[PDB]
Design a binder for this molecule. Sequence first.
Ligand SMILES: C/C1=C\CC[C@](C)(O)/C=C\[C@H](C(C)C)[C@@H](OC(=O)c2ccc(O)cc2)C1
Lengths: 10, 229
Amino acid sequence: NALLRYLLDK
Amino acid sequence: ELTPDQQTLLHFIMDSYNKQRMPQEITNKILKEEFSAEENFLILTEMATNHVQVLVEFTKKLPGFQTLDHEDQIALLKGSAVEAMFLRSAEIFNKKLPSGHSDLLEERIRNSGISDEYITPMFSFYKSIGELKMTQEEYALLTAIVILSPDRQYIKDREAVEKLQEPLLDVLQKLCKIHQPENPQHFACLLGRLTELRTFNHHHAEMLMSWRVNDHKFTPLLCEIWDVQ
Ligand SMILES: C/C1=C\CC[C@](C)(O)/C=C\[C@H](C(C)C)[C@@H](OC(=O)c2ccc(O)cc2)C1
């Protein structure tokens, strides 16, 4: 879930 | 008739909900591209990708959402994607398209490899929400409520999500009592449309299942959000 985490944090 | 703390919350939500838009390049395709099944599906892939991009941006700004455990944040996002997308796509079908483009969008959805068994209840949902002439307020709050649902699979702290959700349900309820006093049942009926939203988790899974037999392809974000692997 690295992509969803990235989109959550940016 | 809304406490000041409820006014603040309402304004945060609407602010956040409104700075999301359907890009013009995608709505242009609805008119301009040829009407083949290959091109129809490609456009839906773009709308879907955009719905999910928009879901995330909305989610990350929801009050208290940063305070939740990181794993649960992801379980919410994935738990909610289908329900939130179908709702948004309803707002778009009814309200954020010029007059003739419902009919075309519809014609594309009707020739993109989706069974009538999923189409019928989809368009029946779109019809029924349009006849309710659902407000922007309503779309927005309802969307926040779906996202912060404590009922999704894999949430470790269901209570923490319930504490973010409750305030949203109280606002929406008061808005109903206020803006629709001749319909005391309004709040219950909006909750009834949430109950019908939950129906699409099953449908969408089936829809993705049929597309995958014909080897259609999906984007990185979409495969990730729905565990298509
Ligand atoms: C049925 C579609 C669009 C009209 C709205 C609808 C019917 O509520 C459902 C779903 C979305 C819309 C948001 C565009 C799209 O459905 C998908 O989820 C999808 C996912 C990956 C993919 O490669 C193609 C589509 C296509």
